[PDB]
Amino acid sequence: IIGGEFTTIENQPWFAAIYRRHRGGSVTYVCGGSLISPCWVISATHCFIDYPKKEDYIVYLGRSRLNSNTQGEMKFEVENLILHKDYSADTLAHHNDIALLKIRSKEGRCAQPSRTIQTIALPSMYNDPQFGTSCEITGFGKENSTDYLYPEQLKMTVVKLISHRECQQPHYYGSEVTTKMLCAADPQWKTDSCQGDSGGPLVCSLQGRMTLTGIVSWGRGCALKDKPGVYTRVSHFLPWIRSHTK
């Protein structure tokens, strides 16, 4: 997250921190995700496509810091790593960038809700807030485009919803953006998602309820003029989600 503010897991209790164990034992950060039910975390396919093997992955819930433990965190293995069959890699514009991780502890349990671990609601089908709506993004991603390191503390920021028409401008993203994608940016382009934020939640308040409206997917650079963050439009994948979480 470029700009924005530091936060803790109490303020995004569904946020999932996902890591991969390398051979030789090193564990590095992969991507964020969102807990939608006790046994299921939703993320982006592009986080996993290079390494599709579910045994390489570690998920944490209730975790506030990147390389240290948070009191009351839970640690999970991935019982199922489900990628979207119709995924595509553009140069930027990943189509169908949605993935589901079935989580289970070494003790055979799913998530147990608490002050730091809760689930997020899915939207109702094709029901998105109007452009100009303010939504929040959450992640451990880069704080400046030139940074080498990821921040140790979890961050959040607020970005505004950009209409499909506007994101379609040639001087924005043109045809790269589809109706299954959502664009969102800052009016001053000061704040944005960046490298490492992928898979994480875009949460909007939608008629009284915190809602997983999007999933961080791609963008050109970070916090650049006319170059918004792009998000998987969750309200367009509910059949996909409901069938696969069975």
Ligand SMILES: N=C(N)c1cc2cc([N+](=O)[O-])ccc2[nH]1
């Ligand atoms: N604007 C976004 N929603 C977004 C930009 C972005 C960039 C990278 N990246 O640095 O490769 C990764 C994920 C991203 N998500």
